[PDB]
Amino acid sequence: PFTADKGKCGLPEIFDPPEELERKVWELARLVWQSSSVVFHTGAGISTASGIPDFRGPHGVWTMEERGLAPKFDTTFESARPTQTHMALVQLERVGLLRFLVSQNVDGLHVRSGFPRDKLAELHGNMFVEECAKCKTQYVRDTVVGTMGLKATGRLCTVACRGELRDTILDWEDSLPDRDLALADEASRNADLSITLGTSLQIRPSGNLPLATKRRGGRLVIVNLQPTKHDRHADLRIHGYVDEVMTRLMKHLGLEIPAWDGPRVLERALPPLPRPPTPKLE
Numbered sequence: 001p002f003t004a005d006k007g008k009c010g011l012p013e014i015f016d017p018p019e020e021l022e023r024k025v026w027e028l029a030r031l032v033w034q035s036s037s038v039v040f041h042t043g044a045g046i047s048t049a050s051g052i053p054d055f056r057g058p059h060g061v062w063t064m065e066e067r068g069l070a071p072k073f074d075t076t077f078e079s080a081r082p083t084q085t086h087m088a089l090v091q092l093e094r095v096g097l098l099r100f101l102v103s104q105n106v107d108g109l110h111v112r113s114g115f116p117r118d119k120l121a122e123l124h125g126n127m128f129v130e131e132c133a134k135c136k137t138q139y140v141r142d143t144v145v146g147t148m149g150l151k152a153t154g155r156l157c158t159v160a161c162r163g164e165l166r167d168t169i170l171d172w173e174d175s176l177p178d179r180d181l182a183l184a185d186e187a188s189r190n191a192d193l194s195i196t197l198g199t200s201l202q203i204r205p206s207g208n209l210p211l212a213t214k215r216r217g218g219r220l221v222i223v224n225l226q227p228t229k230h231d232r233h234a235d236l237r238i239h240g241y242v243d244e245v246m247t248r249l250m251k252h253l254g255l256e257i258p259a260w261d262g263p264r265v266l267e268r269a270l271p272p273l274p275r276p277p278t279p280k281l282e
């Protein structure tokens with residue numbers, strides 16, 4: 001908590017000017033079209049447009065903490081709506097243009113967005129998910145599980161067990177869930193396009209996964225307002241708001257960003273939906 005390295009916090013924001021931004025979002029378009037296996041990696045930056053502050057941005061939790069100030073939340077976790085970005089990733093999965101989604105976010109919004117859990121690795125866990133210590137059954141709740149650091153919640157497993165239910169929020173010392181990390185790693189290795197959205201890429205091994213795609217000749221796209229640990233290993237860096245980038249991209253892709261019907265949980269990815277015919281690229 002005190003000994004914890006919170007990495008580089010408060011680094012200046014970069015804003016690509018409009019014409020560099022329009023060109024970079026078309027190139028990202030081209031790369032989605034060109035790619036067989038696309039993995040998205042998300043961090044706290046995709047939730048700030050929902051009122052949830054990030055960790056290391058100008059008003060990040062750790063950033064403000066360093067300057068003796070407090071993060072501000074403009075919502076509760078329960079009343080937080082998924083962003084245009086969140087709902088773009090749902091539609092990209094539904095049309096078969098997103099193979100796997102890796103998130104370091106505990107804010108619960110990917111799942112609440114209707115995003116299929118069998119295509120999602122939540123590397124730092126989920127505020128709404130408790131897990132039985134025995135059968136390992138996960139309960140996705142409507143309100144945040146009131147503990148952090150993998151403690152007893154109070155409730156017991158109800159599988160046809162009475163096992164002690166614990167939060168999925170990793171403490172500083174707790175290693176990542178093996179299943180989620182294993183699937184996030186395999187997806188990242190096999191990807192030919194890893195795209196990062198609103199992460200500074202500073203936490204091992206979460207931040208390193210997008211680099212594995214680069215091995216084997218995979219392309220790496222970083223989308224982030226601030227520099228990030230692996231900017232140098234990126235084939236494309238887009239310095240702008242992810243909502244704006246993802247709305248331009250979906251628009252280039254011929255895709256609608258679907259309505260969020262409110263909190264819904266989808267265990268398994270449904271069969272893929274029609275998508276637009278691809279442009280002639282080369």
Ligand SMILES: Nc1ncnc2c1ncn2[C@@H]1O[C@H](COP(=O)(O)OP(=O)(O)OC[C@H]2O[C@H](O)[C@H](O)[C@@H]2O)[C@@H](O)[C@H]1O
Nearest residue numbers: 043044045048054055056057104198199200225226241242
């Ligand atoms: N609307 C936006 N559009 C684009 N980028 C944004 C936006 N808002 C913020 N950013 C950028 O988004 C980036 C967010 O980076 P960080 O704040 O480190 O969050 P993490 O997900 O990487 O933190 C990882 C873990 O570390 C913690 O200890 C917890 O365990 C976390 O799970 C910044 O560079 C912002 O400039």
Ligand SMILES: O=C1CC[C@@H](C(=O)O)N1
Nearest residue numbers: 044052053054061106107
């Ligand atoms: O508990 C917290 C503090 C910051 C917020 C987030 O997901 O960014 N989660």
Ligand SMILES: [Zn+2]
Nearest residue numbers: 132135157161
């Ligand atoms: Zn159980």
